[PDB]
């Protein structure tokens, strides 16, 4: 085989069209077949990139000869590059890797990977003098070991990809050979793109079918996902828009169910004898030819899979479950030529020239930093840094529609900056580009995206005489290095959204410009304009009122109006009230207000209307009413929540109505279950400090009545209890409510605790317990019950929950709370109260004076034990005084 000398070709210049020609459809591939009438050499000049798509199980030696000696020179002569496509798995060792199976020649070392890269280009590029290499990064081609996807192989393939890139592609020794990646992944899922992208000329992404085009519908957000724009946005982090190409597929003969894309037109149902349709009209392919990113810039182009089937009509969708469309036809590549013709009609590709930017230094910066196409000006949303002091005119900058950041640095020749020489997105606005794709909504009309206004940095413009930023609704002056604008004689920043209050960053920038103008030409209403501001109101980051004290009275207070208020500017000025906003309007600059006279407190302030609250009382009962009635003496914790997160409080405050009461803790959280006729694993979830999910089974057991025997973790003085019905967890629960309940404490004065602990089931009867409260349901919907309890002291408890229902009406209780204050030795303390009471009865043994004295000490202890503010210290003190008086 004499390999002919490479015919030189011009540099790649978009928009480009590529196509994947299947080797088993070249007529030279397998002489023994009759149906094979196509030839890769016949691809027309409209094809920029002809990819060889081969079946690795096949030899086709005669095709390789025809390809190397005939197709490549013919195709190169007309401008078409021929690219060899290989799978991901060739770039590491493992199953079916081919060259890398030789582990002695190509070990997984730096020398070995380098050797492997060379072997790969030697074989797939230079052997037939081809124009490039295309690696398929698709999960079907991933490295495997013993049919298992292999992490070591994936990591290896990245290093090998880099080594191939040192040989070919834009960073390689031989830049005349292209290095291409084609991928089915979204960028954030593609393991090779981060380290691989600097080495490739182009990235091809397959987007066949309606789902490639529109994305998929996601029902629980009611929104498309993986849309064409989203796939591009992910890749935009790694490659330039001109390197991006999107692909559709032709109809493959005999295609199966998961390979039916309908990207080109179908055979007419009744046109049974027609296998052909070369019409581009209304095809996904023709929409792809015209599609452009809404941001970044205009695309590299499009490609097709199975170009050997160009013009073959798609099999009708009806028969997707013997068609003319399944025959083999000789293509003339009419569809490909028509799609290239559509792209060449796209004026987005006209070159940026001296009519866009007449200043050659500015024009050169744009071309270097932005791109070379007029369509890029409409889309580019990154940074343009203009720090070449040669720049003498900024004419043209208004052609930027979406630029994110503009730096004007040291441009000492520039004498004026205003609307006419600044980006079109100095002011707010929405996307005006229109989609050419189908969408899931009405008439393919999507919600225009907001364009963020450009951020502007200006420093060292020492020749600048006029700065007019008027009427742009600018949010800040941040970026204006005022101390360096030493020539300024006129400034207008009126009609923006600037907070210019004394002390702010904006005011400091302004005052600096003001001194400069004042010293040059004088500050007056002509040379200095700054009013009609409408500064944006934001939510403060934190809130300062963390306590509210209210008398007991017949009133209702709005917690939000009392606790959660305030609007702040982006400059940090806080306006808590109408009064503050009046004082803000009071601010004068050279005698006049800077705030717009039509911008009142109501247009400025943020709204707290959809904020929510959780109000928790001293006994841990909860409501969500924004309004609190003050007729009851009670102490509360109040949490406020943004609509954006009903789980993270943005502010918390304590509200005290009447005299402060200590918040109780739930003394039964973490309680230990030791008995009761009822599932111990579920029983414990009544103590787990959460309602639970309705995914979790929290049923106590089978029959309708269930006990739980338990021990508190800590010694406490118990003053309340609460249990929840299942409706507290799910309001729609089919679980009946507790009709009957009993809370009981163990009778350690008639029975031995050691007996309870040794056989808890023996003790699972009322006779051995003392009932301290009983609930019987009134009838109406109640998500919970709570009741006071009188200074109960007990380590061991029993609870009985009964739904009173029939079979399958299991008591379901999200949580059981036993509330109090912790109090170590509480039994001992209450035992002394009990002894003092006993003594006070022995009216023959003790005189009235002894008893009166003992009474005073008993009262002092009782007073402290029930004090609103609970104090273990004072309780302990009074308890020792009473114990002493007990002797005797």
Q: Which residues bind Ca ion (CB under 5 A)?
A: 685, 688, 690, 815
Residue sitting closest to Ca ion (CB): 815
Whether 354 is a known active-site residue: answer: no
DSSP letter at 112? Answer: H
Query: How far apart are CB 699 and Ca ion at their closest, in Å?
Result: 13
Name the residue nearer to Ca ion (CB basis): 597 or 693. Answer: 693
Name the residue nearer to Ca ion (CB basis): 364 or 694. Answer: 694
Q: 270: how many CB neighbours lie within 10 A of its CB? A: 7
Name the residue nearer to Ca ion (CB basis): 253 or 815. Answer: 815
Name the residue nearer to Ca ion (CB basis): 640 or 710. Answer: 710
Greatest pairwise CA separation for the chain in angstroms: 133
Query: How far apart are CB 709 and Ca ion at their closest, in Å?
Result: 18
Query: Rounded to 10 degrees, what is the CA torsion of 374, 380, 385, 391?
Result: 20
* Contacts made by residues 425-432, CB under 8 angstroms, sequence distance 24+: 425/400, 425/401, 425/451, 425/452, 425/453, 425/454, 426/453, 426/454, 426/456, 426/469, 426/472, 426/474, 427/453, 427/471, 427/472, 427/473, 428/453, 428/473, 431/294, 432/401
Query: How far apart are CB 693 and Ca ion at their closest, in Å?
Result: 10
CA angle 231, 236, 242 (to 5 degrees): 105
Query: How far apart are CB 802 and Ca ion at their closest, in Å?
Result: 19
Name the residue nearer to Ca ion (CB basis): 144 or 711. Answer: 711
Query: How far apart are CB 637 and Ca ion at their closest, in Å?
Result: 20
Name the residue nearer to Ca ion (CB basis): 490 or 685. Answer: 685
Query: How far apart are CB 816 and Ca ion at their closest, in Å?
Result: 8
Name the residue nearer to Ca ion (CB basis): 530 or 710. Answer: 710
Of the residues 42, 123, 138, 466, only one is catalytic, namely: 138
Q: Is residue 54 a contact partner of residue 26, using CB atoms and an 8 Å limit?
A: no
How is 416-430 classified by DSSP, letter by letter? EESGGGS-GGGS-EE
Tokens 């030697």 label which residue? Answer: 122
Query: How far apart are CB 181 and Ca ion at their closest, in Å?
Result: 53
CA distance 191 to 414: 47
Name the residue nearer to Ca ion (CB basis): 782 or 833. Answer: 782
Q: Is residue 100 a contact partner of residue 92, using CB atoms and an 8 Å limit?
A: yes
| Six-digit token string for 765 | 């009867």
CA distance 269 to 281: 18
- How do the residues of the chain divide into helix, strand and coil, expressed in percent and rounded to 5? 30, 25, 50
* Contacts made by residues 516-524, CB under 8 angstroms, sequence distance 24+: 516/482, 516/485, 516/486, 516/487, 516/488, 517/488, 517/489, 517/490, 517/491, 520/487, 520/488, 520/489, 521/489, 521/490, 523/590
CA distance 65 to 28: 9
| Six-digit token string for 781 | 């919907």
CA distance 669 to 686: 8
| Six-digit token string for 178 | 């292209």
| Six-digit token string for 390 | 């040669």
Helices and strands of the chain, counted as H and E runs: 20, 41
Query: How far apart are CB 296 and Ca ion at their closest, in Å?
Result: 51
Q: Is residue 342 a contact partner of residue 286, using CB atoms and an 8 Å limit?
A: yes
Name the residue nearer to Ca ion (CB basis): 670 or 824. Answer: 670
CA distance 158 to 154: 7
Query: How far apart are CB 683 and Ca ion at their closest, in Å?
Result: 11
Q: 481: how many CB neighbours lie within 10 A of its CB? A: 15
Query: How far apart are CB 662 and Ca ion at their closest, in Å?
Result: 24
Query: How far apart are CB 676 and Ca ion at their closest, in Å?
Result: 16
Tokens 């317990």 label which residue? Answer: 769
Contacts of 122 (CB under 8 A, 6+ apart): none
85, β-bridge pairs: 134
Q: Round to the nearest angstrom and report the end-to-end CA distance of the chain.
A: 122
Query: How far apart are CB 687 and Ca ion at their closest, in Å?
Result: 7
CA angle 836, 839, 844 (to 5 degrees): 160
CA distance 290 to 302: 9
- In terms of DSSP H, where are the helices of 575-614? 578-585, 601-604
CA distance 772 to 861: 22
CA distance 538 to 473: 16
Name the residue nearer to Ca ion (CB basis): 446 or 688. Answer: 688
Query: How far apart are CB 732 and Ca ion at their closest, in Å?
Result: 18
DSSP letter at 107? Answer: -
Name the residue nearer to Ca ion (CB basis): 99 or 683. Answer: 683
Query: Rounded to 10 degrees, what is the CA torsion of 507, 509, 514, 516?
Result: 160
Name the residue nearer to Ca ion (CB basis): 672 or 690. Answer: 690
User: CA of 684: how far to CAs of 61, 66, 719, in Å?
Assistant: 74, 78, 22
Q: Which residues are catalytic?
A: 138
């Amino acid at each position: 085989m004499k390999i002919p000398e490479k015919i030189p070709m011009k540099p790649l210049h978009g928009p480009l069209y590529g196509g994947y020609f299947r080797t088993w459809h070249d007529k030279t591939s397998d002489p023994t077949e009759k149906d094979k009438v196509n030839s890769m050499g016949e691809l027309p000049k409209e094809v920029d990139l002809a990819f060889i798509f081969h079946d690795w199980t096949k030899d086709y030696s005669l095709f390789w000869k025809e390809l190397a000696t005939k197709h490549v020179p013919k195709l190169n002569k007309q401008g078409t590059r021929v690219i060899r496509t290989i799978p991901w798995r060739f770039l590491a060792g493992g199953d079916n890797s081919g060259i890398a199976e030789d582990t002695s020649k190509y070990p997984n070392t730096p020398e070995g990977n380098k050797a492997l890269a060379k072997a790969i280009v030697d074989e797939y590029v230079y052997k037939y003098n081809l124009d490039g290499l295309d690696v398929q990064v698709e999960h079907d081609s991933i490295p495997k070991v013993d049919k298992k996807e292999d992490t070591a192989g994936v990591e290896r393939s990245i290093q090998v990809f880099e080594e191939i890139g040192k040989l070919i592609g834009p960073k390689g020794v031989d830049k005349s050979r292209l290095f291409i990646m084609d991928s089915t992944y979204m960028a954030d899922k593609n393991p090779l793109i981060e380290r691989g992208a600097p080495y490739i000329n182009l990235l091809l992404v397959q987007v066949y079918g309606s789902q490639g085009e529109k994305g998929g519908w996601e029902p629980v957000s009611n929104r498309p996902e993986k849309t064409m724009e989203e796939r591009w946005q992910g890749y935009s982090k790694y490659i330039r828009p001109e390197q991006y190409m999107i692909g559709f597929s032709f109809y493959e003969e005999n295609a199966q169910e998961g390979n039916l894309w309908y990207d080109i037109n179908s055979r007419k149902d009744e046109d049974k004898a027609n296998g052909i349709n070369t019409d581009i009209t209304g095809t996904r392919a023709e929409r792809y030819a015209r599609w452009q990113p809404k941001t970044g810039g205009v695309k590299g182009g499009i490609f097709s899979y199975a170009i050997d089937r160009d013009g073959v009509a798609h099999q009708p969708k009806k028969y997707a479950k013997k068609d003319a469309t399944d025959n083999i036809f000789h293509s003339d590549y009419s569809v490909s030529k028509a799609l290239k013709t559509v792209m060449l009609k796209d004026k987005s590709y006209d070159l940026i020239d001296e009519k866009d930017f007449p200043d050659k230094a500015l024009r050169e910066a744009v071309m270097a930093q932005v791109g070379t196409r007029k369509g890029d000006l409409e889309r580019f949303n990154g940074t343009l840094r203009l720090d070449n002091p040669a720049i003498q005119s900024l004419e043209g900058l208004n052609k930027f529609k979406k630029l994110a950041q503009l730096d004007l640095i040291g441009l000492s020749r520039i004498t004026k900056l205003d609307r006419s020489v600044l980006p079109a997105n100095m002011k707010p606005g929405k996307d005006t580009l229109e989609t050419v794709l189908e969408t899931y909504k009405k008439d393919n009309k999507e919600e225009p995206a907001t364009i963020p206004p450009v951020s502007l940095k200006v420093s060292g413009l020492t020749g600048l005489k006029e700065l007019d930023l008027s009427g742009f609704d600018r949010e800040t002056l941040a970026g204006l290095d005022a101390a360096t604008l030493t020539s300024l004689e006129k400034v207008d920043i009126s009609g923006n959204k600037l907070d210019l209050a004394p002390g702010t960053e904006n005011r400091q920038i302004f005052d600096t410009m003001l001194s400069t103008i004042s010293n040059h030409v004088g500050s007056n209403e002509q040379t200095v304009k700054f009013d009609k501001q409408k500064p944006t109101g934001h939510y403060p980051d934190t809130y300062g009122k963390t306590s509210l004290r209210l008398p007991v009275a017949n009133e209702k207070v709005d917690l939000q109006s009392q606790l959660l208020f305030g609007t702040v500017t982006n400059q940090g000025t806080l306006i808590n009230s109408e009064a503050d906003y009046k004082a803000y309007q009071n601010h004068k600059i050279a005698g006049r207000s800077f705030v717009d006279s039509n911008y009142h407190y109501n247009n400025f302030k943020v709204s707290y209307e959809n904020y929510t609250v959780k109000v928790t009382d001293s006994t841990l009962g909860t409501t969500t009413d924004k309004t609190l009635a003050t007729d009851k003496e009670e102490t509360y914790k109040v949490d406020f929540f943004s609509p954006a997160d009903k789980t993270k409080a943005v502010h918390t405050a304590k509200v005290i109505v009447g005299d402060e009461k200590t918040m109780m803790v739930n003394l039964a959280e973490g309680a230990t279950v030791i008995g009761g006729s009822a599932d111990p694993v579920n029983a414990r979830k009544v103590f787990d400090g959460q309602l639970g999910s309705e995914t979790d089974n929290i049923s106590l057991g089978w029959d309708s009545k269930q006990s739980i025997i338990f021990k508190l973790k800590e010694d406490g003085l118990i003053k309340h209890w609460r249990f929840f019905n299942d409706s507290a967890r799910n309001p729609e629960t089919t679980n009946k409510p507790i009709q009957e309940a009993s809370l009981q404490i163990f009778n350690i004065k008639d029975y031995n605790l050691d007996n309870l602990l040794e056989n808890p089931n023996k003790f699972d009867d009322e006779k051995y317990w003392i009932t301290v409260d009983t609930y019987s349901a009134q009838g109406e919907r109640a998500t919970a019950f709570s009741n006071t309890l009188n200074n109960i002291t007990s380590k061991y408890w029993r609870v009985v929950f009964d739904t009173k229902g029939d079979r399958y009406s299991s008591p379901v209780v999200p949580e059981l709370q036993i509330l109090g204050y912790p109090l170590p030795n509480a039994d001992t303390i209450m035992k002394t109260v009990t002894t003092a009471k006993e003594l006070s009865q022995q009216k023959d043994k003790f005189s009235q004076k002894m008893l009166d004295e003992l009474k005073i000490k008993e009262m002092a202890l009782e007073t402290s034990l029930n004090s609103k503010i609970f104090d273990v210290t004072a309780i302990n003190a009074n308890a020792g005084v009473l114990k002493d008086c007990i002797e005797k």
